[PDB]
Amino acid sequence: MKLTLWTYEGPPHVGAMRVATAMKDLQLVLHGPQGCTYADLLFTMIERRNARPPVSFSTFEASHMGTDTAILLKDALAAAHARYKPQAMAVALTCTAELLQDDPNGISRALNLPVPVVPLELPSYSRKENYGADETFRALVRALAVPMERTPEVTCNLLGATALGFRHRDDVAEVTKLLATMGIKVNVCAPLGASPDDLRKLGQAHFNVLMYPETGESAARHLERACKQPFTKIVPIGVGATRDFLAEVSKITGLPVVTDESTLRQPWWSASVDSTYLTGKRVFIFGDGTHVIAAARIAAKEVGFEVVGMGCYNREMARPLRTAAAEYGLEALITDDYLEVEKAIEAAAPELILGTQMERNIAKKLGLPCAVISAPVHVQDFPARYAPQMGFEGANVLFDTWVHPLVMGLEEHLLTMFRE
Amino acid sequence: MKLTLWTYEGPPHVGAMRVATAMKDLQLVLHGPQGCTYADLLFTMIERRNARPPVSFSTFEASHMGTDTAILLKDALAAAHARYKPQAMAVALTCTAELLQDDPNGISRALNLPVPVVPLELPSYSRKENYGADETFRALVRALAVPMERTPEVTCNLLGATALGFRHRDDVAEVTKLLATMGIKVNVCAPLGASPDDLRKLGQAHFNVLMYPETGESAARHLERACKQPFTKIVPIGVGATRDFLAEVSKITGLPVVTDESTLRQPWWSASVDSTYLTGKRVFIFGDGTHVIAAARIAAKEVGFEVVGMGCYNREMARPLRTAAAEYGLEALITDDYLEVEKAIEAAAPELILGTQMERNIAKKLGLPCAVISAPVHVQDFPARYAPQMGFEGANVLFDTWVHPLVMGLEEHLLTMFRE
Amino acid sequence: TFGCTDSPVRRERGQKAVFCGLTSIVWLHRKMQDAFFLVVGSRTCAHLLQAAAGVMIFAEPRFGTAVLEEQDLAGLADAHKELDREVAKLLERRPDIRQLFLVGSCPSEVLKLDLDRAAERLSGLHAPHVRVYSYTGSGLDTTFTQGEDTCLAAMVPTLDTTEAAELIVVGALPDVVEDQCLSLLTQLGVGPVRMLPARRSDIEPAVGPNTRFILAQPFLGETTGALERRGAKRIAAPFPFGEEGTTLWLKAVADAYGVSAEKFEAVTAAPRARAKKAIAAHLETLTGKSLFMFPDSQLEIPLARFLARECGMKTTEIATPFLHKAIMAPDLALLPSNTALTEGQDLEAQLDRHEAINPDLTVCGLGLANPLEAKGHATKWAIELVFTPVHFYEQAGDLAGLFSRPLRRRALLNG
Amino acid sequence: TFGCTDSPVRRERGQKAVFCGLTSIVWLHRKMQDAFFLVVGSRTCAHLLQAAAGVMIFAEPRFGTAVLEEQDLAGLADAHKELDREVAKLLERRPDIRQLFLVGSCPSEVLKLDLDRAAERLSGLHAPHVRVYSYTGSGLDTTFTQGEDTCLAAMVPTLDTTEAAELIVVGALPDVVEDQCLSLLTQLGVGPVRMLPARRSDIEPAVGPNTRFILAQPFLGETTGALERRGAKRIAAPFPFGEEGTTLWLKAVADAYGVSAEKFEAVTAAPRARAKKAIAAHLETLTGKSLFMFPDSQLEIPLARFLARECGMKTTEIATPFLHKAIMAPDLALLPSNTALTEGQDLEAQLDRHEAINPDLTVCGLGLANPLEAKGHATKWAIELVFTPVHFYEQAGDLAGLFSRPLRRRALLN
Ligand code: SF4
Ligand code: SF4
């Protein structure tokens, strides 16, 4: 038993929901209690979606104890198929259903539908959202990807992008265009904006761009054997990170690194004279594993901050972090307790925090500038405007986002200082 | 004499400076006192430029009275030519020099350089920055534009964009894009990113796209005679505004209106359910003439605010405004006194103000949500990230910009209400 | 054209899109200043509360969830030891808390983890500074606002006993409203009147054989049940929504307490006019419009009753998560006859009914509203209507407001 | 290797990139709590103050400009009625003001509109609740920090008269620093000691035949001239920048007031070590680096004197808007001999002398700083050094710091 107010991650079935929603023509059935369909809200309000999530529930209640429950998941799967007619489906258990007898494999097998139905292993008492996302996607790729002959031209897949993904939309956009600048067109971006039909056509692309380790690295791994596909290990957030990502791609493809840097304004901005008081402002960095490693290289090497703290809430990424953190003379902080994060930030005593909605809130409490660099995030951070993190325009966005809270801080200090 | 703290506009020579800098291979010589070169600072800091403004000064002081002054402007023009070798030049008086006898025509005539040197009339006691911008640009076009045979394909110019222009960079970008979607490529964008060489090649484009009335409508007018060029009268800020602008263009070129609406997210955003409480929140709008007329259509017809005040500092645009304002059942407020703006906002009692760095500060003083929609503006509003106002992506920016202060306003009310 | 008592209610089961009773905590905690609601459940439970509390989560709310970990599943004797010491740790970390509620979840119940002994033991260990109760909010037992009921009802058996005949108004209300309510009841001449729940735990109303109580809220079946079992007798009344609602509501207490139409008209006169006028502003946009309501809160009947009667809307299908026949009787009397009633739901059946119905306005949950807006149906998300002040006279306009606005906005967004 | 008294200073004319004396109002309105600085000038003047005051403009600063309108050009009699009304308006609509400075612009002076008599006249009308002075900030007459000088010198002829032998510290200072200065000077045994300008008008130093005074700031040519004319004797000293500066500055006062070399060494001891140490932190990135300074503040020479001696920097060309032979003497004597000196400038000539020199660090104005960074030179923008606390001991660290920071940043980005 852990006393819990804030959580950084949902339970694993959200991660499932998050992958199923990313896809088109795909139905997910969750065995779970009535009243437990709340996650709708996240996809329809926070992401701002126009159709209902492609997710259905068996919606059992108190007066349904007895093997009554297996039969309910059956008719849930039945109904979902009859009604929507999806190229494939996938089935799993909510945390409550995990404590019940009914088996997602056995009921799926018995009933026996026309299309593939994938049963998912979601340990909802030991794992979380991000795992859910990865497994669910591992399992879909594992079931649907087959060896194939490579495209005539050079192509790749974008692995990892999802529903409720923090700037996923626009990162896909921005990566597509920086690949296109090197002659490389995209095969299939998945899970996001992909059908099961498309998931079979995976084999034919030379390499995989692993966009988000946290959401599609298992799938990247599985594809390493299945169709002998090498995934990119360097995630392109920041300029240096992007250059190295492009060089890594040149290494994978043989192709010469071509860049369209005509709109890249961050290096000059940060090189500018108004940027000089940024020099070694102490920043504390918290968030999802991938964005913290990215932020810190920008912070120290592209903006000239002193990274004074570094950590993440997802266990899954603790070693990539602990490694990187050391490089900055720092001991990573792996925690999902925000009360810990609050303790760390007070200890580090930074002048700027970069984190999640929670850190924005701690920062508010402590009267410190702050920017948001990672999920979980509210509606604010699924903007209508174009706002990637990755690549060049992404590097612009990041510089503007992070510098603002600080400029405002100065303007606040000054104005009150001279009020009296 | 009018007691003046804040000014919305510089003296006309900044307007000159503003047009000179927008161009390449053009030198401007200002007859003016030593110490009066401060304007560099705007172009170097606010706009963030990498070379010094192509602007030089005669830099006379106290011990220079006597016709010693004409001689100084002579050798200023001489030195500037010798040193930089620009395709053409332009010469003007700062306000101090306007009260002296040396005349910019007679000295430029006498000296007689290889390239054209354009003398400018800048009534610095009657007029302001915006006029300065227009006249200087009128004068340059009037001296350099000549009739010409139309391009084989359909082309147009972008008239009005300048240095220190609020979102001019990205607006040029965004408009080029939406023209190219209709088959129409751009001939020469001027003053911004244009040389004198380019200003001669104006005649060969079918029509002029007047981007900013305030900064290049004189030039638009003069080109209406010169090479019988019709300028677009509808400025594309907002979706409706942009659609009508595109229709206006189809009317001018014959060509079918084609739109790439795949990234246009504003309509759905405001159509969505969390946009419901936006309905008829009282907004006061102030700023440069053009951005206020644009804002108000969006405000009332695309976002569902109640426009509760409307006005501008730019007397040049008072009629365009007074007309539009009436259509909202409102009496335009034409003032350059910010103390009037403060009174009007208090009388109107809006829930949201949209205006200038000044209005931002009035808003702050009154604890009211606020967005910036118009110059004058500080460094924060010459962003690294892509941020146009015009066209589709522009419409997305505007929606995010304007809603944010409000959603934060609620978040702040709620959190303190809850504290309790 | 106005009566529904003999209408057959579609008793419906199937796939559901509702909130469990846990959600209710999010709004209860506010009214009961002295209390902490400690859910015993899974991370699903925690994440739910998070989603439902939006921004409030950052305001040190006084609720939280003891999230069942993997080693709590087997060995269910640790369960009590684990909780015991997780509770003390919390009761040290916020000493101001006086009522602790062990709110039970689906997980907690599948494990037949008996919260009731736990509630009783902890009460001893932590006496007499903090008294700890227990009730269910598990999706299995409870839909959305039923969580207030199960809570209040659990508190009722332990209230101090009494002789006197005083009014208890049942249902947590926005504070402001509660006062307007107090005020009018006084001016009618109704000596001592209390709220259940109270603002603090030291001023909990006593109950006895002579106590009368009235419902501020439709979803209070069990609490009614428990109060009756203490010998206190209910007062029937249509729920105070609109001028007609509020009036009859007052009228019902007036009658039972022997108050002259004289004192009634002279008290009730001023405020009834206020209301009728404020409401009138919305008639334009609202009269003639057809209304469909999915189940969420049990508030859909009396709200539909106000919307059709005082706003002149046409009721299509009104749907409620549960339908207490006896309690809902006055409002059903006033509801238009042509009205299909649904207890419970089979989402898909319902969505299919509504598709071929095509109503004007559609009242629903947040996971439906947008999908439905993208289809061209106007929506008015329902959750708002629990927490916004909407009862009684002063809020009548604002209430109607809440349903005009979405339609106002729809027109506005195309001419 | 250390001495510059006989160096020929390049007395230079031509195209200029400097601020007029108006800018000084910014900066010094803050120190004088009681005062309002009302420029009579054009919208150029208004817009300049705006640019210079950045965000301060929103803080209801106590300055503003009566902007000359078209109808004030002809003729020069309407002008005054007009002004009076604008001034009267200003004085009723903030009664706190007690001294009103008519600050003079280029335009007003080209219009020959006599602010001297106006100030004389307004004093009557609005006496005795407000004293109204007048001085010049016009670019013709004045460069940046000169604005303070002209002002302070206008205040002098009017100060109360006295006999007593008090010390006067002339120069506006960050309040912080003001107290540090005051404190050291007090525990040294030197009472009493006043500041010019004072924080309020009712506590203005009085001046007499036995008054001694010292300059906190190198840009006070006229104010010395004026204090001298009322019988007050300057105390020469290098300016207090760095540990050495602050020491000699103290030393010079302590000499002239006959303090023991022992009460001095006891009082000054702790602070001086605290400083040499703070400076140590910067020694690493700073030693060896070549410095260039364009003209702006008149603080170029003493700061350059500080950076070379205490931070081991090579001086190349140190340029100044005005060079006072008598005042700059003690600093010039401690400035390295290898040093080129410029008074005034020809912007374009300098830019050539500079490009050919390729200095490590360049100290310059905001209009020049980025185009020099994009062109490859590290810069430190000058205006900072006027408003940031930098004088005396406790501020020496931060001072060195202001100069290391940019070089540190330039390394850090490659
Ligand atoms: S109590 Fe039941 S309905 Fe509520 S979150 Fe837990 S499992 Fe879902
Ligand atoms: S230099 Fe002269 S004209 Fe220019 S702003 Fe200064 S006082 Fe005014």
**Does residue C18 contact residue C144 with C-beta atoms inside 8 Å?**
yes
- Cα–Cα distance between A173 and A188 in angstroms, integer? 13
For ligand 1, say whether the CB of C106 is within 6 Å of any of its atoms.
yes
Domain A148-237 has CATH 3.40.50.1980: yes
What would the two tokens of residue B300 be? Answer: 């009332």
- Domain boundary among the residues D138, D158, D178 is at D158
Q: Does one domain contain both D205 and D119?
A: no
Residue pair B27/D348 in contact (Cβ under 8 Å)? The answer is no
State the amino acid at position D81 in one-letter form: K
- Nearest alpha carbon to residue A286 among A336, A237, A240, A329: A336
**In whole angstroms, what is the distance from residue A382 CA to residue A198 CA?**
26
∠ CA(D143), CA(B130), CA(B178), 5° rounding? 125
Contacts of C59 in chain B (CB under 8 A): 415, 418-419
**End-of-domain residue from the set C138, C158, C178:** C158
Contact C352, C345 (CB under 8 A): no
DSSP A305-332: -EEEEEEES-GGGHHHHHHHHHHTT---
- Check if the beta carbon of residue D9 is closer than 8 Å to that of residue D341: yes
| DSSP tag of C113 | -
A-chain residues near B273 (CB < 8 A):
45
The answer to whether the CB atoms of C72 and A1 lie below 8 A apart is yes
CA atoms of A196 and C400, how far apart (whole Å)? 47
- As a whole number of angstroms, the distance between CA A403 and CA A399 comes to 6
DSSP string of C34-66?
Answer: TEEEEEEE-HHHHHHHHHHHGGGGGS--SEEEE
Q: Which helix (H) or strand (E) holds A134?
A: helix A129-144
Phi, psi (degrees; rounded to nearest 5) at B2: -120, 120
B11-147 CATH pick, 2.60.420.10, 2.30.290.10, 3.50.50.60, 3.40.50.1980: 3.40.50.1980
Beta strand ranges found along B112-240 (DSSP E): 117-119, 155-159, 185-190, 207-210
Q: Cis peptide before C128, with omega less than 30 degrees from 0? A: yes
**Beta-carbon separation of B397 and A385 below 8 A:** yes
Structure tokens at B47: 């706009």
Nearest CA in chain B to D374: B50
Which of D99, D17, D115 lies closest to D66 in space, CA to CA? D115
Domain boundary residue, one of D158, D180, D202: D158
Interacting residues of A292 by C-beta distance below 8 A, sequence separation 6+: A285, A286, A310, A311, A312, A321, A373, A374
Instruction: Kindly state the DSSP code that residue C349 receives in the 8-state scheme.
Output: H
Beta strands in C118-270 (DSSP E): 131-136, 167-170, 193-196, 212-215, 233-235
Residues of B in contact with D89 (CB under 8 A): 3
B416 CB contacts (<8 Å, ≥6 apart)?
none
Contact: A35, C21; criterion CB under 8 Å:
yes
- The rounded Å distance from CA A94 to ligand 1 centre is 9
Using an 8 Å CB-CB cutoff, list chain B residues near C402: none
The CA distance from B47 to A364, in Å, is 31
How many angstroms away from the CA of B401 is the closest CA of chain A? 9
The 3-state DSSP class for residue A245 equals: helix
Would you say the CB of residue D147 lies under 6 angstroms from ligand 2? no
Angle in degrees, CA C51, C54, C58, rounded to 5: 115
Which residues are registered as beta bridge partners of C341?
C9, C318
Q: What is the DSSP string of B117-136?
A: EEE----TTT--HHHHHHHH
Please answer whether residues D330 and D248 qualify as being in contact, where contact means their C-beta atoms are separated by less than 8 angstroms.
yes
Task: Output phi, psi for C27, to 5 deg.
Answer: -120, -20
Mutate to test the pocket of ligand 1, among C16, C48, C63, C110 (most ligand atoms within 8 A of CB): C48
Its domain, for residue C49, covers: 20-158
Q: Nearest to residue B166, comparing CAs of B396, B374, B340?
A: B374
Q: Is A313 on the interface with C (CB under 8 A)?
A: no
DSSP structure class, residue C22: G
Q: Nearest Cβ partner of D373 from A273, A277, A419?
A: A273
Instruction: Check: CB of residue C203 under 8 Å from CB of residue C178.
Output: no
Superfamily of domain B281-374: Nitrogenase molybdenum iron protein domain (3.40.50.1980)
Amino acid letter, residue D84: D
> β-pairing, D314-320 with D290-293?
parallel
Which amino acid does the sequence have at C313?
Answer: M
In angstroms, what CA-CA distances link B176 with A181, B119, B184? 21, 32, 9
Tokens of C136: 């269910």
The whole-angstrom separation of Cα D268 and Cα D259 is: 12
Distances (CA, A) of C161 to C167, C214, C222, C232: 14, 18, 19, 11
CATH code, D37: 3.40.50.1980
Task: With beta carbons less than 8 A apart as the criterion, state whether A185 and A158 touch.
Answer: no
Domains A11-147 and A238-280+390-420 fall in the same CATH topology: no
Domain spans, chain B: 11-147, 148-237, 238-280+390-420, 281-374
Distance CA B14, CA A419 (A): 31
| Nearest residue to C40 via CA among C22, C57, C23, C60 | C22
Q: Is the same domain home to C413 and C370?
A: yes
Token representation of residue D332: 């010039």
> How many structural domains compose chain D?
3
Question: Long-range contacts made by residues C74-78, C-beta under 8 angstroms, separation at least 24?
Answer: C76/C111, C76/C113
Nearest ligand for residue C23 CA: 1
Neighbours of chain C (3+ CB pairs under 8 A): A, B
Short-list A294, A257, A264, A258, CA closest to A402: A294
CATH of domain A238-280+390-420: 1.20.89.20
Neighbours of C6 (CB within 10 A): 7
* C291 contacts C314 by C-beta, under 8 angstroms: yes
Residue A383, classed as helix, strand or coil, is: coil
The technique is X-ray
| Phi–psi pair at C236, nearest 5 degrees | -75, 145
Bridge partners (DSSP) listed for residue B185: B155
Which alpha helices (H) appear in A23-116, and where do they start and end? 40-41, 68-84, 95-98, 104-111
Do residues C197 and C126 share a domain? no
Taking the C-alpha atoms of residue A58 and residue A368, their distance in angstroms, rounded to an integer, is 46
Sequence-distant contacts of B51-54: CB under 8 A, at least 24 apart: B51/D371, B51/D374, B52/D367, B52/D368, B52/D371, B53/B17, B53/B20, B53/B21, B53/B163, B53/D367, B54/B20, B54/B21, B54/B23, B54/B26, B54/B27, B54/B28, B54/B84, B54/B86
Token representation of residue B8: 């919305």
Buried b (16+ CB within 10 A) or exposed e, A40-49: bbbbbbbbbb
Give residue D249's identity as a one-letter amino acid code. Answer: W
User: Rg of the Cα trace of chain A?
Assistant: 23
* Angstrom distance (rounded) from CA C236 to CA C210: 16
Q: With touching defined as 3+ CB pairs under 8 A, do chains B and C touch?
A: yes
DSSP B79: H
Nearest to B37 among D90, D140, D367 (CB): D367
Question: Burial, C173: exposed, middle or buried (Cβ in 10 Å; 0-12, 13-18, 19+)?
Answer: buried
User: To test ligand 1's pocket by mutation, which of C25, C45, C108, C146 has the most ligand atoms within 8 angstroms of CB?
Assistant: C45
D325 CB burial (10 A radius; 0-12, 13-18, 19+): exposed
For residue B269, give the amino acid letter: W
CA of C311 to the centre of ligand 2 (A): 68
Contact between D56 and A273 using a beta-carbon 8 Å cutoff = no
Q: How far is the CA of B46 from the centre of ligand 2 (A)?
A: 21
Interacting residues of A71 by C-beta distance below 8 A, sequence separation 6+ = none
Among candidate residues B104, B67, B71, the one with its CA nearest the CA of residue B89? B104
